[PDB]
């Protein structure tokens, strides 16, 4: 199983936030930790993406673009899986040192997004998602959001996306019913990532007022790339309508 062998081999390990859990919770400290964790997860997403089958065939500017646009959905989907595997979806397992109960969900001012992520986590159980389906679906999320004006080499992106869809068909192979379930789940990531992008953007704009720290790469991506998504210049590729 060459393709799956590779996906298993490149899967990131454990990433910690560096949060101080030995202190009462506050909005500013929770969000400063989420921002630091997002920067550390982005570094791991870069190392992972560069090692994916075929990814180096894309134009380098397209490699960078798709990682920056898809990062939030990749992170949502991986966190939903960790939450399912580690705590049976009872809390959101952002990191081993950043685990959100409902109180923290509320305190973060991201409560609606968190409830939707907990529901995603539960779906992993409800739909009996296998670890191999998880790995193939997460890779496909890298190839699921692009600019309306086109990538530099759009044809090479389309071919690589199609090949990942073929690998998902091979893992499924009753096949249609499963494809329907998995593509509905994939499509459900996108509105959650949309709402997290909106929150992140608004928080960056008011960050000095609320004492939240953003690392350099997070501030750049949220100010340069995220607004292309919010302004409708970069859009998800949905399976179902939508």
């Amino acid at each position: 199983p060459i393709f799956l062998n590779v996906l298993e081999a490149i899967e990131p390990g454990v990433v910690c936030a560096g949060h101080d859990n030995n202190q009462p919770d506050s909005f500013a400290a929770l969000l400063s930790s989420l921002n630091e964790l997002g920067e550390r997860q982005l570094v791991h997403v870069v190392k992972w993406a560069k090692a994916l089958p075929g990814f180096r065939n894309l134009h380098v500017d397209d490699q960078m673009a798709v990682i920056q646009y898809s990062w939030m959905g990749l992170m949502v989907f991986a966190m939903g899986w960790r939450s399912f595997t580690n705590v049976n979806s009872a809390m959101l397992y952002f990191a081993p040192d950043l685990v959100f109960n409902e109180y923290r969900m509320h305190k973060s001012r991201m409560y609606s997004q968190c409830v939707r992520m907990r529901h995603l986590s539960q779906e992993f159980g409800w739909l009996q998602i296998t670890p191999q389906e998880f790995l193939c679906m997460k890779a496909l999320l890298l190839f699921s959001i692009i600019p309306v004006d086109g990538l530099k080499n759009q044809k090479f992106f389309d071919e690589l996306r199609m090949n990942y869809i073929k690998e998902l068909d091979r893992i499924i192979a009753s096949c249609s019913r499963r494809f329907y379930q998995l593509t509905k789940l994939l499509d459900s990531v996108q509105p959650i990532a949309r709402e997290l992008h909106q929150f992140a953007f608004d928080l960056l704009i008011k960050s000095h007022m609320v004492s939240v720290d953003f690392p350099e790469m997070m501030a750049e991506i949220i100010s340069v790339q995220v607004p292309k998504i919010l302004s409708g210049k970069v859009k998800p590729i949905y399976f179902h309508t939508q």
């Binding site: 982005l42 870069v46 750049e220």
Partner: peptide, 9 residues
Amino acid sequence: SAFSRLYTR
């Protein structure tokens, strides 16, 4: 960009 500097390492 900070991202592109990271990527091109």
